[PDB]
Amino acid sequence: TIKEMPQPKTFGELKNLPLLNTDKPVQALMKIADELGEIFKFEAPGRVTRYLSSQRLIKEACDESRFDKNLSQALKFVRDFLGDGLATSWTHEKNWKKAHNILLPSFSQQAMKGYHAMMVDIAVQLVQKWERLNADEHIEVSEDMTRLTLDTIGLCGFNYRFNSFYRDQPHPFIISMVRALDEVMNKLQRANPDDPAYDENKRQFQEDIKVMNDLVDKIIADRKARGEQSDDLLTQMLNGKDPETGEPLDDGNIRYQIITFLLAGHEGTSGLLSFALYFLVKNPHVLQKVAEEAARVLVDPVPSYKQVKQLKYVGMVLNEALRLWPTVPAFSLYAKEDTVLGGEYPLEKGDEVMVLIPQLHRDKTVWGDDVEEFRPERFENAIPQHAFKPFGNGQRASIGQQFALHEATLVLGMMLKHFDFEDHTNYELDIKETLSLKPKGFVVKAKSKKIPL
Numbered sequence: 001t002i003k004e005m006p007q008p009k010t011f012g013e014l015k016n017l018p019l020l021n022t023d024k025p026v027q028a029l030m031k032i033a034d035e036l037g038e039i040f041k042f043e044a045p046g047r048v049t050r051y052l053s054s055q056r057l058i059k060e061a062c063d064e065s066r067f068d069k070n071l072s073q074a075l076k077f078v079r080d081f082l083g084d085g086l087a088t089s090w091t092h093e094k095n096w097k098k099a100h101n102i103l104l105p106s107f108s109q110q111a112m113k114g115y116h117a118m119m120v121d122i123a124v125q126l127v128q129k130w131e132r133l134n135a136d137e138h139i140e141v142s143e144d145m146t147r148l149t150l151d152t153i154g155l156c157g158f159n160y161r162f163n164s165f166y167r168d169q170p171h172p173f174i175i176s177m178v179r180a181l182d183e184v185m186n187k188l189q190r191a192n193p194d195d196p197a198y199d200e201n202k203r204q205f206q207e208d209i210k211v212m213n214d215l216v217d218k219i220i221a222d223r224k225a226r227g228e229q230s231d232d233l234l235t236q237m238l239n240g241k242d243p244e245t246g247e248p249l250d251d252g253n254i255r256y257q258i259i260t261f262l263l264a265g266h267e268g269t270s271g272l273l274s275f276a277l278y279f280l281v282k283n284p285h286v287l288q289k290v291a292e293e294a295a296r297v298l299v300d301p302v303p304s305y306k307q308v309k310q311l312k313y314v315g316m317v318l319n320e321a322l323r324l325w326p327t328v329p330a331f332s333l334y335a336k337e338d339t340v341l342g343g344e345y346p347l348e349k350g351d352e353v354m355v356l357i358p359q360l361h362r363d364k365t366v367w368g369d370d371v372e373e374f375r376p377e378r379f380e381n382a383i384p385q386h387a388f389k390p391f392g393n394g395q396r397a398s399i400g401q402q403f404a405l406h407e408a409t410l411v412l413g414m415m416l417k418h419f420d421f422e423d424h425t426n427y428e429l430d431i432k433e434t435l436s437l438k439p440k441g442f443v444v445k446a447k448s449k450k451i452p453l
């Protein structure tokens with residue numbers, strides 16, 4: 001039956017916008033969803049979207065005959081620096097399908113055998129850093145996972161070394177990228193984002209975009225100077241031809257892809273690794289089970305590709321981390337035609353819906369009563385269509401899913417092979433939002449098991 005859609009408190013002409021005047025908007029949206037249920041409208045000046053939280057509705061949103069990817073307001077702002085790169089292009093834009101076809105083979109399960117050695121290079125640097133800490137020191141978890149994930153995509157993708165583990169001050173590229181993302185988040189909170197009152201933030205934003213483009217220049221210059229032949233992402237982009245069209249990407253689009261991969265390659269995965277260790281230190285029995293599997297499987301000084309694929313319980317741990325805290329916590333869709341959602345909510349062509357992934361992942365009708373518990377065994381055996389969506393949906397799902405999960409499986413495996421962890425501060429979870437999610441202030445101490453590399 002057609003029903004009126006729930007909607008939270010409005011503030012005159014500002015509509016719902018003041019509800020998200022917070023540094024933790026996705027967490028605030030989860031609270032609204034707790035209060036209003038599976039669907040609610042959220043208006044701000046000049047835009048409307050509808051936040052979905054149940055598998056019953058999200059399964060319909062994920063029907064590609066009915067909905068296509070939408071550029072949320074956040075993506076539209078991110079597009080100021082990512083352009084028509086893969087993540088910020090419309091499905092119908094020429095460069096989407098073109099770049100997709102050119103790059104997809106670079107991200108398959110098979111391409112992972114190729115990247116494995118270089119993933120190991122950076123994982124070893126992480127393990128060595130932690131082996132070299134003195135007794136009175138600790139680990140800043142999200143910070144070190146970011147060093148690893150950035151360096152891994154730099155190296156695997158572009159044969160470029162960020163050398164993040166040689167730095168205690170974060171890489172200039174990351175300083176600017178984080179500030180650009182912070183600006184996007186602040187811009188989402190403005191009534192009139194084009195107001196010339198914000199021309200200063202715009203100045204800084206453009207300076208940070210220049211910094212990102214300066215790094216792209218260095219990556220391209222290094223490629224030309226090192227004068228080696230590689231089959232990495234950049235090589236595929238410079239020479240690869242779209243089999244559908246028979247054209248290569250233009251330099252402008254390649255530049256956008258480089259920045260896209262550096263961002264995306266690192267943000268999601270670093271949060272996943274940090275959430276996973278967090279859950280392990282809070283769920284000691286699960287830790288023991290991971291440690292047992294690492295010790296049992298990782299019998300060589302460094303992991304092989306085949307050994308990583310045998311870390312089945314580590315993979316379950318990672319999926320359960322993604323269930324509770326999917327690190328790219330939403331994605332947006334638009335109605336391809338006039339339709340009715342859920343037998344209940346009429347939509348007009350172009351109307352936007354937002355999939356609130358953390359809420360979908362707490363839907364008791366799919367998962368059972370215990371959704372707040374960290375229980376990797378969930379994945380042991382058979383879950384429903386579109387209940388678990390940490391990598392988005394359909395042909396606009398993450399191109400990085402296998403890359404991210406191979407890396408994180410490798411790294412978490414090595415971490416638990418080589419160390420025991422202590423939650424020395426009895427850390428209370430604090431989730432930082434930079435569009436993506438990651439723990440803030442999560443610290444531990446590691447006690448080496450003294451197993452050489």
Ligand code: HEM
Binds near residue numbers: 260327395
């Ligand atoms: C745990 C790690 C990661 C998570 C949770 C994640 C999540 C996502 C999600 C939710 C989307 C869809 C967003 C939307 O519909 O608007 C997406 C798209 C994307 N992901 Fe990831 N991802 C991760 C790792 C990576 C990595 C490692 C790469 C690259 C190396 C990457 C590259 C991309 C790209 C390029 C897209 C756009 C794909 C397309 O539309 O053609 N991702 N990912």
